[model samples]
Target: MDDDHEQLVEELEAVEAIYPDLLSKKQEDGSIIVVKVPQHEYMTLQISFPTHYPSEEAPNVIEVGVCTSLAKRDLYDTKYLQHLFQEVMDSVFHRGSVCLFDFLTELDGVLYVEPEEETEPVQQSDIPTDPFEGWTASDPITDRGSTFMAFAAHVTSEEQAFAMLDLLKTDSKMRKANHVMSAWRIKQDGSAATYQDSDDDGETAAGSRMLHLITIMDVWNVIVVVARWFGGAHIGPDRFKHINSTAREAVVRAGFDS
Candidate 1:
């Protein structure tokens, strides 16, 4: 084999050894491999960078049906199927870039799936409004405009939530934001209604909320915290802290302090 082909084989072998369950060689296609994942597991994927390996761009991927017969049961309608497929790819590619290769290289076997923890519900009264009143938004624009849309529109009803969640699982854009936050309105029936950012320009209150959630998650003792921050002229650590504290206090005033 030529040196280039030899190097490609070595890299593929290395990745396969690290994630045996998810990676497999196809004898027919010398350069192609199939990544298999269970239906219930989180699906993050990576492929060897094409002609340009590490230096250029990493492997590119598209979601393919695995166990289509089984998927048909859960995905009844065409719309639901599309959503599921989208989220699955989102979790894998995450921002249209193959950064997970960095994470996968350190693993053995299929990576353990992290269970989604239940976030304590904050009462409607407790949800703070306009916490970032005068701040200009700073979110990136993309097909979805902002990642917050998934959290807001989906993430509540199991049906809708899973559809978007699945998209996020496979797609890279789901985790590319500089910030993210999600809120849910729990129904009496034990279901939830979630809301995330929905700003096209990434310079609105919704964008601020997404960023605040990221910041709070970085600090605080609360496991499933929901909050918003304002930016623009008065953006700083102290202002963020104030905004977080005020928001929590407002929620308490509304009788939803957890």
Candidate 2:
């Protein structure tokens, strides 16, 4: 009796029973189960449970696909949705209770109710790129009342990151950002493949953050520079969100990895 998997499959099958109208598929022993909404309104939800179950590692969402019949008309940011799901998984982790049912139940709610906040595709439309001609930049995003700017360029050394960092700071207009965080990752001249560094530039605890972002994104051979012009109010943890978002935008604009 594998209670770990047995109990999970029990709940899974129960959910499937309720949503019988949705297209359902199951892998052997019921490890990977997928459910598609009735009439294919959104897409199929792929559920994968890791061995840890009630403790470590939340279930993985392998694929989120759109209904093919309506492909020409609608597109979704599956990556964004994946992140949103992961946030809830963190909550599920905190609860210390089984939450697969709660997750699916709320997701079902999303299919019908129109959301009010924002969507990835909808927000991407407004982001601006370097309009000049040669260089690329993540369109600056102002959040929590403070302005964040991330600028990137092709470079492979400390010298290059600094040079570009200068250009971004040279303009008095952009220089107003109280703190400019900088980070660069290079594969090095054939050592073991990883070399990186970051500078906080007066904004405490910001430089290392840029390093973490680039490393995790697997973006290499590029320099990412971010600036923050603090608004009157303190935004706390939310400031880091703006910093990374702006940095990623810059990296993406420069075509650094995908």
TM-score for each candidate, following the candidate numbering? 0.26, 0.38
Over the stretch 1-258, how does candidate 1's per-residue lDDT look in tens digits? Answer: 247556556656665666666665553332455555432433333233456433243444433443345654574433443354344434444333333344343332233453555546645321123232111122211222211112222123445534443453344443344444433232323434433432223335655564465445442111122223222444334333555555455433332333
**TM-score (C-alpha) between model 2 and the true structure:** 0.38
Q: In candidate 2, which residue ranges exceed 4 Å CA deviation?
A: 1-134, 188-195, 230-250
CA shift at 164, candidate 1, in angstroms?
63
Q: How far does residue 72 in candidate 2 sit from its true spot (Å)?
A: 52
Best by TM-score: 2
Candidate 2 residue 85 C-alpha distance from true site, Å: 56
Q: How accurate locally is residue 91 in candidate 2, as Cα lDDT from 0 to 100?
A: 61
Full-model lDDT for every candidate: 0.38, 0.62
